[PDB]
Design a protein around this ligand. Structure first.
Ligand code: KDL
Ligand code: KDL
Ligand code: CXE
Ligand code: CXE
Ligand code: CXE
Ligand code: CXE
Lengths: 573, 573
């Protein structure tokens, strides 16, 4: 994309805020008129001096000065506020769009991505668009208008002396194009290195205990020194590009003044031009040099937001998770059936699942038994369509999972596990997450009571109104699991995927969690990734998965009689 | 801290780079001299006009113009590069200092802190110091020098007319102080809101699967909309503060011109002052208006980096982990002994451990068995002094853990667990992490072979030179655990803390891990947080912990005969 093609994509997110641009332009025009009036009123005083001015006017001069200063202040405030308003609105819109697009990405997208990269895209890359939104555009318009008006003036006074403008405009245009490409390249490099800095800090924070145990504060110091210096040198590249471009443009511009002075040294080429137009033309190019410098100065900021806009639009054109299904399931009252389901993780060679033929009958419990890495977690992820299967089909209520909408499909499945993510909000808002307007406080309290969680909630500062989250008031593993059980009871999801806890907690918490899960939770179509023999023995059907295939299936007594894999696994339990 | 007190703290990190400031100042002086010479050479041409100048001079005029433009370009490049160089060096120094300080903080510091806050401090707050490092200082010096020189000229020409300056300077000073405080407050608010934005995006990327399962893309959209708009409105507060401050300062300054014009309206006050000094004084105040505006404009940036500096220095004055011990242990050849150790986690009311009397003999293995949350993980954390015990003492080779240096103490302990943090580096560099210069490639390969890890390492692209990490080429749970076993074998740490895996892997990986851990690892002073009965039966001593107290201790057969906690614990196994 060229600097015009990417700007036309950025215009639709500035159009809702073009009223600020219009008001800023009107205020700037008023300010220019006031300054012109001030200069007209002030030139006699500065040039001729005091004494040649009428005394009566001098009495009213201070009030005029104060009023003109007040008008200038009002217009300046209006212009600055409107420009910054448009810039901030555009930056906020870009941030929200990036956040929503990241929210719509597939689960596989986040495995190949680093968190620091996305964080820098939201926090750093979006801010760089601010320049090319309001301030740079207005500056470009003003300086271009000044340059065009000066060109028309120069060709009106002397067209022959102005052929140097036709000679030199392509040169400055070429230089501006070259340095604009350079600016965009440097800006993209800076964005990448900012993401790298964020990632390096994140990796130090995530492995801080490993840095303490093994030492290596020195090696991490050097590793971060490299990235910090890389960001420093990228900024230096930007500065050097700007500081080399501006003087070169100014020198090419002054080539015109040099040509005019050389032409004015010829008596033959001096009397024809009356020696009065030459002075006007020379002053015109002198006045032309300044807006050119302003334009080249604003070009660097404009190309830093054009490079950010290009990256942001490339991100916003990415492929989100496929939602081509149109059916809307209300309640899954049927059986979840796997029909020859073969799945391979993206980027991996060996399939995680091979020819899986698994049925979960309605209202029954199926226990997935197997070692770590066998594929039970893959089955759980495929049921909720976090990944799409390569071959086969998974049927919910007799229809394939890819035919239902993602929202309606995921409204049917409840995921209960020891590891619970707590959203930064109140406890009741966590129990009724995404459905606060649907469930009342009485229903929330009933669900929390049924999940055996009211005791610890009532032992807090505000009970159900205590603001909890991952950052702040947190809960132990049992308490968050009971909160998840309360959420699943309130939602009343027909299908339950239970990822069992590998380690038992204290007797009270264990008893409460077991009572909740047994009496209240497990009365629906349940698939449990089980870990303790007790829950295996209480399951309606047991499926043994080894190396991505099902090697055994049946009940506890049946599989004990078969003396298969489950026999040995129950033995070592 | 006042704006002068926080600047004197920032000066020592600019002093290493004052050569850039000096060179920038010299280049600016040369540029001013060149501009003065150019103006002296240019005024006759613009005012008198062409035709009144010597033709011989006009012959050499274009070359003079080209040379002056080249000189201006060179000086401008030098000044800009030096200013930006100093600013970038200071920003990089601040980033490195923040990174090292965060790296030196205690483990308890990171439980009360959000990752996004620290990330924003490194990435955003450090950058805001750039303005107040080189560019703002030079601008302040230049404009202050201009203002002071204009004041001296004004009192030289007419001291009586200049009393208005003495009257109006306190007013502008008071206004500047007020708006400087406002700028610093707004900047601190903006830093806080940037941290809030980074945490909100980071929390959505951590609960993305919970957002998909429960819906709530709408609620997360609104939650991020609030923070985005908060950052928008903070930036707009900054803009409004600047745009209200500057016109008010300009109006107070123009009050002096109003006073001069009012005084000039009296023939008594005009004939006495010769009516020629009044014009000079008026022109002087008009010329003085501009540097005041430049100073007020640069004040906003200066106060955004003064606020950033204040926050950064408050962070850098924080308390790191205590290292008051002076003994240096070379190799722990004795017993780790707990003597009445009572520990409470920071912020928690109930103690995590109570009256722990635990001895780990040299070259022996002790198995810690208990429910999750009992305190075994707390014991493991206390051995490595991630936390300091409230009461009692822990003896390493007969001396308390608080008497040794942290580095020497942690050189004695090796932590092996299923969850392994992979530093972004080659496999051999991970095995020899922090000790690459000490161990050769032959030793690394021998350790990897002994850890039964040479197979899958040879099954990679570059073997031991393949760059792995948390972001990029990752490894399964068994592979990183075997890499950690290889690291611990290479380091040959006398004391081993083994946090056992709660779930078995496939047959090959499980067999390799068990062989490595048994034959090679477990031949030293080992403390195992065990999970499988087989490990318990192979341990030299067993300790059972409930509710942070040891309830039963002995051997496998002894504890079976005791019919205590371990009897039941083995029973449901
Ligand atoms: C073409 C013709 C026109 C056509 C029609 C228009 C066309 C379209 C226009 C396009 C552009 C659209 C722009 C827009 O549409 O803009 C709108 C404005 C609406 C009007 C637009 C149409 C206009 C129609 C025509 C009107 C006119 C007829 C709203 C907005 O944008 O801004 C709104 C802001 N409004 C202003 O800023 C007024 C502000 C902006 C208005 C913009 C005007 C320019 C553009 C308009 C175009 C103009 C056309 C002509 O005008 C001013 O000032 C005027 C000052 C004059 C300056 C003169 C200059 C010098 C004079 C000459 C000198 C010689 C508003 O600020 C609030 C206060 O901020 C500071 O106090 P604080 O301390 O911070 O509290 C200021 N304190 C200051 O000191 C300012 C500064 O320090 C000055 C320092 C200077 C120091 C000088 C020292 C001097 C010393 C003396 C010397 C010794 C104070 O100012 C004031 O006091 C003003 C003060 O009296 C003025 C004083 C008098 C004048 C002084 C000079 C006199 C001198 C002369 C002497 C001769 C100001 O009141 O905040 C909300 C958002 O916040 C909220 C909300 O409450 O609404 C709350 C927020 O809640 C939370 C949160 O969640 O975060 C949680 C809460 O618990 C809480 O924590 C809060 C928050 O943090 C708490 O602090 O936050 C959240 O709910 C949020 C929503 O999320 C949003 O969605 O909403 C913004 O809304 P938003 O946009 O929805 O976000
Ligand atoms: C008082 C008197 C003095 C007393 C003594 C001094 C006192 C103390 C001074 C205080 C201040 C200290 C400052 C300092 O101390 O400064 C030092 C400088 C050392 C000198 C200081 C003392 C000086 C003594 C006296 C000398 C003089 C006698 C080093 C530094 O700071 O900068 C060093 C940089 N040097 C410069 O930039 C020269 C640069 C800077 C020098 C600074 C001077 C100013 C300050 C000095 C004070 C001056 C005193 C008087 O001077 C210039 O230019 C001059 C240009 C002239 C401009 C004239 C203006 C106009 C004229 C008038 C016109 C009318 C260096 O750049 C490299 C190249 O960058 C771009 O190419 P790239 O494409 O990006 O590769 C530029 N390409 C450009 O196009 C520039 C730009 O586009 C221009 C676009 C413009 C477009 C215009 C279009 C026009 C169209 C035409 C019209 C149609 C190219 O420039 C050049 O081509 C230059 C070019 O020929 C010039 C051309 C001729 C002139 C043109 C004009 C002619 C026109 C006139 C016509 C009449 C430049 O060569 O990079 C290293 C770091 O990188 C490395 C390293 O290799 O060293 C590698 C890095 O590795 C990695 C990584 O890990 O990241 C991994 C790698 O695999 C790889 O990936 C790399 C990297 O990414 C790969 O790309 O990165 C890592 O290892 C890192 C360490 O980590 C650091 O620790 O080190 C920096 O070192 P660092 O500081 O250690 O970091
Ligand atoms: C002496 C001072 C005078 C000040 C004058 C100020 C003028 C204010 C003008 C405001 O600037 C707005 C300029 O932006 C206009 C950009 O238009 C782009 C339109 O292109 C749309 C192309 O299609 C986009 C569809 O995606
Ligand atoms: C001393 C003269 C100063 C003139 C200043 C003029 C500044 C203009 C800079 C604009 O640069 C924009 C670069 O974009 C390229 C413009 O697009 C060119 C389209 O192609 C035109 C084809 O015409 C060729 C005729 O030679
Ligand atoms: C017409 C243009 C002329 C340009 C002149 C440019 C002058 C260059 C001056 C460079 O600026 C440096 C100013 O900074 C000096 C700050 O000094 C602070 C010293 O205070 C130290 C106090 O103790 C600190 C100990 O912690
Ligand atoms: C129309 C006149 C324009 C003059 C411009 C002057 C600008 C100076 C602004 C500097 O502001 C800095 C604010 O810091 C306060 C300075 O410290 C004051 C120390 O106390 C001095 C005590 O003297 C009191 C005499 O009244």
């Amino acid at each position: 994309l060229s600097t015009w093609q990417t700007f036309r994509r950025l215009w639709p997110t500035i159009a809702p805020f073009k009223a600020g641009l219009i008001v800023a332009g009107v205020a700037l025009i008023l300010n220019a008129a006031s300054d012109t009036f001030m200069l007209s009123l002030l030139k006699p005083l500065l040039d001729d001096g005091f004494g040649k001015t009428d005394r009566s006017v001098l009495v009213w001069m201070p009030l005029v000065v104060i009023g003109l200063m007040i008008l200038r202040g009002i217009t300046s405030y209006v212009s600055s506020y409107c420009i910054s308003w448009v810039s901030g609105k555009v930056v906020m819109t870009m941030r929200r769009r990036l956040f929503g697009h990241m929210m719509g990405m597939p689960v596989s997208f986040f495995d190949k991505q680093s968190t620091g990269t996305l964080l820098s895209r939201i926090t750093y890359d979006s801010e760089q668009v601010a320049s090319s939104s309001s301030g740079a555009l207005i500056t470009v318009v003003r300086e271009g208008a000044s340059i065009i008006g000066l060109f028309i003036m120069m060709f009106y006074y002397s067209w022959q002396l102005s052929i140097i403008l036709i000679v030199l405009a392509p040169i400055v245009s070429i230089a501006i194009r070259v340095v604009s490409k350079r600016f965009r390249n440097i800006s993209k490099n800076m964005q990448n290195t900012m993401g790298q800095v964020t990632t390096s800090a994140e990796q130090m924070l995530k492995g801080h205990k490993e840095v303490l145990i093994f030492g290596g504060q020195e090696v991490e110091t050097k590793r971060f020194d490299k990235v910090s210096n890389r960001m420093r040198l990228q900024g230096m590249k930007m500065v050097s590009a700007s500081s080399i471009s501006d003087p070169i443009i100014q020198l090419i511009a002054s080539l015109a003044l040099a040509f005019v002075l050389y032409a004015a040294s010829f008596p033959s080429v001096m009397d024809s031009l009356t020696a009065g137009t030459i002075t006007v033309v020379f002053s015109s190019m002198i006045a032309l040099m300044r807006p050119l410098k302003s334009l080249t100065n604003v070009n660097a900021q404009f190309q830093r937001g054009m490079a950010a806009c290009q990256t942001l639009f490339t991100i916003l054109d990415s492929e989100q998770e496929k939602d081509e299904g149109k059916r809307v399931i209300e309640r899954a009252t049927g059986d979840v059936e796997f029909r020859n389901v073969t799945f391979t993780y993206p980027g991996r060679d060996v399939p995680a699942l091979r020819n899986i033929n698994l049925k979960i009958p309605a209202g029954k419990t199926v226990a997935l038994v197997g070692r770590s890495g066998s594929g039970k977690s893959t089955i759980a992820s495929l049921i909720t369509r976090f990944y799409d299967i390569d071959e086969g089909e998974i049927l919910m209520d007799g229809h394939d999972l890819r035919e239902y909408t993602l929202a309606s499909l995921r409204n049917q499945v409840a995921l209960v596990s020891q590891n619970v993510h707590l959203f930064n909000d109140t406890v009741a808002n966590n129990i009724a997450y995404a459905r606060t307007e649907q469930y009342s406080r009485e229903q929330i309290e009933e669900a929390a009571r049924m999940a055996y969680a009211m005791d610890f909630i009532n032992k807090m500062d505000n009970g159900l109104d205590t603001v909890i989250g991952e950052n702040g008031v947190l809960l132990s593993g049992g308490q968050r699991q009971r909160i998840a059980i309360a959420r699943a009871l309130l939602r009343d999801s027909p299908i339950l995927i239970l990822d069992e806890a590998t380690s038992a907690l204290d007797t009270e918490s264990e008893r409460a969690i077991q009572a909740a899960l047994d009496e209240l939770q497990k009365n629906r179509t349940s698939l449990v990734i089980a870990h303790r023999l007790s829950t295996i023995e209480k399951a309606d059907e047991i499926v043994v998965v080894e190396d991505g295939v099902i090697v055994e299936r049946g009940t506890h007594n049946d599989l004990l009689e078969h003396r298969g894999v489950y026999a040995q696994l129950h033995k070592m339990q």
